[PDB]
Amino acid sequence: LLVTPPKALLKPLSIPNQLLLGPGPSNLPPRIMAAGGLQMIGSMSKDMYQIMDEIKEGIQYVFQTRNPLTLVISGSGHCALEAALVNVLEPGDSFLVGANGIWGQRAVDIGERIGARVHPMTKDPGGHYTLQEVEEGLAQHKPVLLFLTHGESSTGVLQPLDGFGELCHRYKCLLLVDSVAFLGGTPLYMDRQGIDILYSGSQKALNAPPGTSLISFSDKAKKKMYSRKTKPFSFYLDIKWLANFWGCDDQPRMYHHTIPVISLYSLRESLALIAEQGLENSWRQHREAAAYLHGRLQALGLQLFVKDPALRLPTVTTVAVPAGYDWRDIVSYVIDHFDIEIMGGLGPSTGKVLRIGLLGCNATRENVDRVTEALRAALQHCPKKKL
Amino acid sequence: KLLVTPPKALLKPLSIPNQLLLGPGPSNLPPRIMAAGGLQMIGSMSKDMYQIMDEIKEGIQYVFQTRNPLTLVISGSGHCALEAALVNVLEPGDSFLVGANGIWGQRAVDIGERIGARVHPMTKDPGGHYTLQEVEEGLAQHKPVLLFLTHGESSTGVLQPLDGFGELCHRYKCLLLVDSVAFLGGTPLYMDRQGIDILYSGSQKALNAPPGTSLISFSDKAKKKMYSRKTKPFSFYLDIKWLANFWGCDDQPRMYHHTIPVISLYSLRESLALIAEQGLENSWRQHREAAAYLHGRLQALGLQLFVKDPALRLPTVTTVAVPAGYDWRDIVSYVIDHFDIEIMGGLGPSTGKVLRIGLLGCNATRENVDRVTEALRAALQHCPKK
């Protein structure tokens, strides 16, 4: 006992109630909370495998793919992205990146750590890519893989994906897409759109807690991952091992690492919620709830950051920071006086935007009113600073 | 035309069985910890989420006995903690010595090779352990930058003494990375005093915690090495400079890096609370007592224990030699089908040579030892003979 039992740890755990209207994680409805409080089962029991299997069907549904190599990564969005990158890229492979926000920048950082010859196409916070711009990119750097971000949480932008699959394949290159927008925004049809890898952190698209990530790989991608002459740099994210345990190959399942049993309860149950509601109904709900916010922000005299309404990520909306205010003051006001969490910017967008989130069953008209009164009080009572 | 209709399986209620988990972990969760798991979300970067991280950290300092400011939760499982440690400390080309006496050693090796280390295993059959003399011959021959040792071998049921190994490794200018699931039951662990430079565990293996989070600690010698390398480590997700910052271990303010598993952390904290109330000494007693009573009850069933020396027996995970004439799969399956009790066979080098029975935290009761003993007794009676 160099260290006595902590004093802080002898008090009951107490957490505040907060309405979470940032980019995610969001609040959890009762059913999903309940799943989180259930008892443990064996991390390699037949029921645990039955659950994984249902989850997998869920990921197939929410993504629209027949890919047998579909599975949950035992970590967050950064971990899914990495798993994808660490497997598909061999040290020395050319890697093209759609760097129009932080998630692009992250892709780049990871790709450099793992020895890829990274080639960013950089665009200021606000922008998106055209089939033409990507094609010039594909010609110039002859890459093995393209990263694109579908839903940009940094900038509030919704990248159209139609065409990009068939373009990348025509240049003998795969297409990795980071989507949080598959539930609200535009429909996603992986197989049809020709996307070769598609990933998301459960907590960003579903009403799920953080710690787990949905991922899917096309056969073209498997081919590339499974035929490389070097071993990928991680064992934790090694896809051969992971595919086996998740039941995506012929053989019996081997111990690899321990999956987060409890979260998987919740993940499954969240994939259930959407499975009942249906994709089409969920698209409507978000697109309707967003619009009403867009309208209510403008009535507060707030300028939306993404000028073209067609390029607006419904799940995460970006407001331009009003002239004469410190964005920190506003963000802090909304949390202190209304227990509402919003967010400023992130990476390139830092300090240029506010970020407001409408995620799943929190994408209500009521919550848009609650956050609209909060901002309206904040615009009223915060100081005018020299920016 | 949707390619894939809404799954039929997913329109039915989630239903799970009740199972007494007496394998190596995860174990069953007491009510308090279940409750924590069912609470509402808070901001993944709110001041309260930071207050919770900080308490957790104190917990890890207590359960490990360290003043190390570079202590934190890895946002992944034990393989992920080990990797984070290895990916940061080892630079491609560094000599790395490994105490390969079970699977976890073998995993260390696999990881070290993927990240370009010149790995040097000291291999020993399932059953064995290392002596200060054996390690020293190793330290001389391969002049390594780091040594991996497994404290509690869940593969073989062995309890590696750690005394001496810190001061030895430092005398040869090399760090000491230890994988311990035995800090709660078995032998006391005093990281700082034992000279251990890195120490990790998957919450679910030592605490009554759910999987998905891992406790880790680094000495200042280790920070020095991780923070002064000329190359970037191969992972961003486990990059320690970034992680140390977000977990509040350095001077600066906290930056978005990745999203920590809020809900699991509730549970992790609450489990570190449970032990904080019980106290380390009381927990050591409880496990060591509960193990002994099992050892005695298995022998009365005519079962041979796998680790011959009683001093080298990991209390938290016990290995029985598979009785002559029996398929181990039959027995394992009998226990689950007729008593809702989960035990395990072997793993890696130990595969098909052992059964593995677990006594973890508040499941380390005398009642559960009876329940599993009666299961095995019935299994010896109803399973095929040979």
Numbering used by the authors:
A (entry chain A): 6 to 392
B (entry chain B): 5 to 390
What does the paper say about this structure?
Human alanine:glyoxylate aminotransferase (AGT) is a Fold-type I pyridoxal 5′-phosphate (PLP)-dependent enzyme, which catalyses the conversion of L-alanine and glyoxylate to pyruvate and glycine in liver peroxisomes. The protein is a 86 kDa-homodimer and each subunit comprises a 21-residues long N-terminal extension that wraps over the surface of the neighboring subunit and is important for the attainment of the correct conformation of the holo-protein, a 260-residues large domain containing most of the active site and of the dimerization interface, and a 110-residues C-terminal domain containing regions involved in the recognition and binding to the Pex5p peroxisomal receptor. The AGT aminotransferase reaction follows a ping-pong bi–bi mechanism that relies on the formation of the external aldimine intermediate, in which the amino group of L-alanine replaces the ɛ-amino group of Lys209, the PLP-binding residue.
The S187F structure superimposes well onto the normal AGT counterpart, with a root-mean-square deviation of 0.48 Å. Although the overall conformation of the two proteins is virtually identical, significant structural changes can be observed near the mutated amino acid as well as at the active site of the protein. As a result of the mutation, the loop that contains Phe187 substantially changes its conformation, and moves Phe187 into the position of Leu188 of normal AGT. Because of this displacement, the Val185 residue of the mutant protein also changes position, and its side chain moves away from the PLP. The small hydrophobic pocket that is formed by Phe187 and Leu188 can accommodate Ala210, which eventually causes a shift of Ala210 and Lys209 towards Phe187.
